[PDB]
Design a protein around this ligand. Sequence first.
Ligand code: FAD
Ligand code: FAD
Ligand code: LYS
Ligand code: LYS
Lengths: 506, 506
Amino acid sequence: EELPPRKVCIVGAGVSGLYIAMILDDLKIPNLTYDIFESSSRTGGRLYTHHFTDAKHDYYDIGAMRYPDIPSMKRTFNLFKRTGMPLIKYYLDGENTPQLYNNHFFAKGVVDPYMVSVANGGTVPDDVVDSVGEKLQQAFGYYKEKLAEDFDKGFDELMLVDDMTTREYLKRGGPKGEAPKYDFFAIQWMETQNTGTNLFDQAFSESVIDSFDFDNPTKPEWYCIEGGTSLLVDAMKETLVHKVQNNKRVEAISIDLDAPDDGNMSVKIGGKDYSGYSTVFNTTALGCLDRMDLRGLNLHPTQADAIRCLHYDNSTKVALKFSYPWWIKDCGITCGGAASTDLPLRTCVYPSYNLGDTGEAVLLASYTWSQDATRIGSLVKDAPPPKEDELVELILQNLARLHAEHMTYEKIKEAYTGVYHAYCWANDPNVGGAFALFGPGQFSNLYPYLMRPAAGGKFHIVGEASSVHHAWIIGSLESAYTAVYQFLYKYKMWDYLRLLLERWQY
Amino acid sequence: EELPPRKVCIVGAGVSGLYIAMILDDLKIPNLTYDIFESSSRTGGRLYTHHFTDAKHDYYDIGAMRYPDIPSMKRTFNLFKRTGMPLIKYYLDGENTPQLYNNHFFAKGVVDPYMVSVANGGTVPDDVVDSVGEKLQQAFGYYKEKLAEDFDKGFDELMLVDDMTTREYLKRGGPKGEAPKYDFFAIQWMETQNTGTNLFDQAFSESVIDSFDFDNPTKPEWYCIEGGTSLLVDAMKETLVHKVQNNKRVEAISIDLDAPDDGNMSVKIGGKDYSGYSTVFNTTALGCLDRMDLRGLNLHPTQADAIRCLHYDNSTKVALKFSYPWWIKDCGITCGGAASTDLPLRTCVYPSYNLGDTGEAVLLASYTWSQDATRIGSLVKDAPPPKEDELVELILQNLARLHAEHMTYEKIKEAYTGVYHAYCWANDPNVGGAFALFGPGQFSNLYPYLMRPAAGGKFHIVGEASSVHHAWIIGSLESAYTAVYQFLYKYKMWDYLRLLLERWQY
Ligand SMILES: Cc1cc2nc3c(=O)[nH]c(=O)nc-3n(C[C@H](O)[C@H](O)[C@H](O)COP(=O)(O)OP(=O)(O)OC[C@H]3O[C@@H](n4cnc5c(N)ncnc54)[C@H](O)[C@@H]3O)c2cc1C
Ligand SMILES: Cc1cc2nc3c(=O)[nH]c(=O)nc-3n(C[C@H](O)[C@H](O)[C@H](O)COP(=O)(O)OP(=O)(O)OC[C@H]3O[C@@H](n4cnc5c(N)ncnc54)[C@H](O)[C@@H]3O)c2cc1C
Ligand SMILES: N[C@@H](CCCC[NH3+])C(=O)O
Ligand SMILES: N[C@@H](CCCC[NH3+])C(=O)O
C-alpha cells in the first residue's frame, strides 16, 4: 500500500496501553505495527485482581473495583461491552453497615452520636457536627451540577478556583469570601467524615470531582466485574495482534534529531537499544516516567517539573478470608456497602459479589488512602509474606470493635481462616503511588504542560494522570484515545482519523 | 523511706524514652522504678547508624546525622557532653559541589543557568529564578529573627499565621496581603530550590522553622558524631539501671478508674497484661500510638484526632560503598557538603567523616523527603535484600549525570563495590513515617490537645512530634524533660521537682 512502514512504541501494558493497542488493531492501518513493553511480569497495571484460589468468588480487586453509571463513564462501559464483561450490581450503600467514630456507633436521629461537638466537650462546632454532607454540598454543589451539564465546561469553570485547597476554600468561604467560613475543627471533621486523612490539604477541584463521582447528582447505580476487574485485562490482552512483552522495563526514551526519518525514536531496555519508532506512547505513572533518562527528548522544563511534582495519593487494601460470611449471617449486613471509622482500618468494604454464599468468604477488611494508607502500608509486604502478623492482629481487633453490636473478637478470630493478602500501591515500584491527586494550582498550571506532545509531536504522556478523571479507568481511556488522535493528526492520516471519530468517539 | 513504691512505664526506647530513663536514674527517687519496652529488636528508634562493617568510617546514619550549634540546641549538646560523644565538624556547605537542574549545571554569576525562566522559554518569572534565597528570607526573615531572640515567644507570634501553608502565604503575600504576591511557577521554583517536592503545601510555620534551623541567622557550625549517631544510643543504653526490654510491642494502654491507687495503669504486650504503673510515658511516633487500643484511657476526641491526623513527612536514604572516594580525588569535592538536583536522587551528601580516607569510602548517594522519598522508597526493602538492582542502577546513572563535569558513568560504575544499603522511614512499622511535619492550622489547633496529659495526669504523649522542634533530637529531649516535670508535679514531689530544675533545665 501507500502508507510507509511505521512502528510505534507503547510503554506500559495497563489499561491505557492496552486500549491504545486495541484502537490500533481496530483501525488496521496498513504497514503500522507496535511494540508494547511492560516492566512487570504481570499485565494490567492498576487493574489487579488477587485470586486466593480460582474459585468463583475467592478474590479481591487490589486496584479498580467499582464503576458508576454516569454519562462521563460511557467510554468505560463501552469497553466493558466490547469485551463481554459480566457486570453485576455494586452496592456503594448497603444496609446495617456500622459507623464508628470516637468509640461511639452512629445512631439515626441522635444529636452528635459520636459526642465530638463542642456541646459535649469536643471541638467540632455544633452547627457542623451533624450537617457535614449538607455543608459540603453547599461548597461543591454549584460546580458538581455544572459538571453534570457538561464535564469539560464544568471543569473549565472549576479551574477559576483551582489555586485553592479544599481547606482554604472552606476557611475563606470561596474565592470572594462570600460562602460560609469554617474554623479548623469544623474543616477537620468534614474531612474525617468525607475523605481520607489530610486530603483537604490537596486541591479543592479534586475534592469537587470526587464528590461528583461518589455522590453524583443523578444518584447512579454502581457495577463491578464478576470474577474480578482482571477479566478485563485478560480480554484486552488476548485480542492483541502483538502480544505484550513482559519483564521489559524502559529506562530511557530518545529521539535522534540528526536523523530526519519518521522512525527516529528509541527506548533503552536492560541497556539494549530498541529503535525505529515513529511515536512513543508512555503510559506509566509519572513516578516511573520520572526515573527514566529523558534527556534525548528535550522536554520543556515545566513539563519535566510536572512529571516530578504532580502529587500522587497513596492507597492500601487488606483482604481477609473467613470460613463463613459472618457479617452477613450475624450482623445482617446482607447488601454490600461499607463501614467507616476513625480506627486504623478506616473503611471496611463488604463485597457485592459473594452476597449469596454461605461458606468461605473474602472480606475487604481495610481500604485506606493518603496517610492512613501509608500507616497500614508500613505493616505490608507487596512481594513478600512478623509485621503482617501485626497487620492481621490489628485488622481483627479493629473489626471486632467495628462490629461489636453483633460480634465478639473471639468469634471473628475463630471464623478467620489464616489466609489474607494486603497491598500498598506506593510500595509498588511499577507505580510509585496509587493515582494522581493534584495539589492547589496544579491542574490549572502544571497539567497543560504535561499534556502537550513533545519530541516534535511524537512523544505522548498518557494515562489517568494525563486526564481530568484521576483514579478512574475513564481517565486512562480518554487520555489514550486523545493520544491516538494526535498521532494520526501528526502524520496527517486523515482517512484513519475520521475512522477513529466514527468508531471510537463517545 | 517516705515515698511509696511506684513504677512507671516508658513505651519506646528511642532517644526520648532513653532520656526519660536517664533523668530518672539521675534523680534517684526512692522506691521509683521503670520498665522500658521497645517493639523492635534494636534500640534507638530514629537514631540509627548502619555499619556495613565495624571499620572506623564504614557506616551511614539512617536517621539523625547532623547538629547545628545554635542556642535552642543546647540540651542536645549537653546530652552529647554527658555521654562523651566524639564530635567532629559537619560541613553543611562544602566546596565544588555540583548543582543540576533542567540538565544544566549551576554557574556562578550567570543569569538563569538552569534556563528555566520565562526569558528562556520557561515559566519561572525572571524576577524570581535567581533570587529564591532572597525572596524566601523576606517571607521568613521577620519570624526567623524573632525565633533567635527567644524561640518560645517567636513561636507564639508565628502561630498567628499558622492557618496558612507556605504556598498560601506566598500567593497572598502574608495574612494582610501586604507582602509580595507570587504566582504558581514562582512558588514552585522556590520549593524546588529550597525543600522537597510538594512541601510548600504543608504549614508555613514549618517552612519558617526549617529555614531557621538550616539557615540560622547566627551562621552556626554543624557537628556530627564520629562513629555514627548510634554511639549515643549505646552510651545512653548502657547507663540504664533497668535495661531496655526489646521485642516488646505495646498493643494497648489502660487505666482502671475503679481502682483508686497510684499504680492503676496497664499495657498489653503480646496479649499479656503488665500492670501496676503510676504513669505511662508513650514515646512512639504517633502512627504507632494510633494503632494501639487506647479505649482504656478515655482520651479527649480532639487529642485522639491529633494522633490520627498530625501529618508525617517521608524520608529515604541510599548509601553506596566505593573502592575509593572518587568525589574527593577526581571531582575536588574535598570538604563534605551536598549536591542538589531535580534528578530522582535529589540530594547527594558527601560525608564529613571520611575526608582524609583514600580507600573504601561510603557515599550518601541519595537523601530525599516527601514524594521524592516515597518514589525512591518504592524501590527499597527495609528488612529484605530486583527492585534494588533497579535502585542501584538508578542511583549510579543519576550520579554520573550529577558529576559529569569530572566523571563518566563507566568510571563511577567501576569504582562501585556492589555494597549498598537503603532505607525508607515510612515503610518502618515501628515509626510509620520519618517525622512530624504539620499541615496548616495543625500546630495552633491540634497540637495543644496532643500535649495535655490524659488519664488524670498519668498519660503522656512524648517525642519529637510533641514539641516545637520536629525532626530534631532537641524536640524529643525537651518533650521528654517536660513529661518528667509533669510527672513529678502530678505526684507533688517538690524536692525532686526542684532537683530536676537544677540538674536538667537548659
Ligand atoms: C487503589 C485504587 C483503586 C481504584 N479503584 C478504581 C475504581 O473503583 N474504579 C475505576 O474506574 N478506577 C479505579 N482506579 C483507577 C484505575 O485502576 C487506574 O486509573 C487505571 O487502571 C490506570 O491505568 P493506566 O494505564 O493509566 O496506568 P497503569 O495501570 O499504571 O499502567 C502503566 C503500566 O506501565 C508499567 N510500567 C511502569 N514503569 C514501566 C517502565 N519503566 N517500562 C515499562 N512499563 C512500565 C506498569 O507496570 C503498568 O502496568 C483505582 C486505582 C487505585 C490505585
Ligand atoms: C531521616 C531523618 C533524619 C534526621 N536527621 C536528624 C538530624 O540530622 N539531626 C537531628 O537532631 N535530628 C534528626 N532527626 C530527628 C531525630 O532522629 C528524631 O527526632 C528522634 O531520634 C526521635 O526520637 P523519639 O524518641 O522522639 O522517637 P523514636 O526515635 O521513634 O522512638 C520511639 C521508639 O518507640 C518504638 N516503638 C514504636 N511502637 C512501639 C510499640 N507499640 N511498643 C513499644 N515500642 C514501640 C520505636 O521502635 C522507637 O524505638 C532525623 C529524623 C529522620 C527520620
Ligand atoms: N476511583 C477510586 C479512587 C477515587 C478517589 C480518588 N481520589 C475509588 O473508587 O475508590
Ligand atoms: N532534621 C532533619 C530534617 C529537617 C527537616 C524537617 N522537615 C535533617 O537534618 O535533615
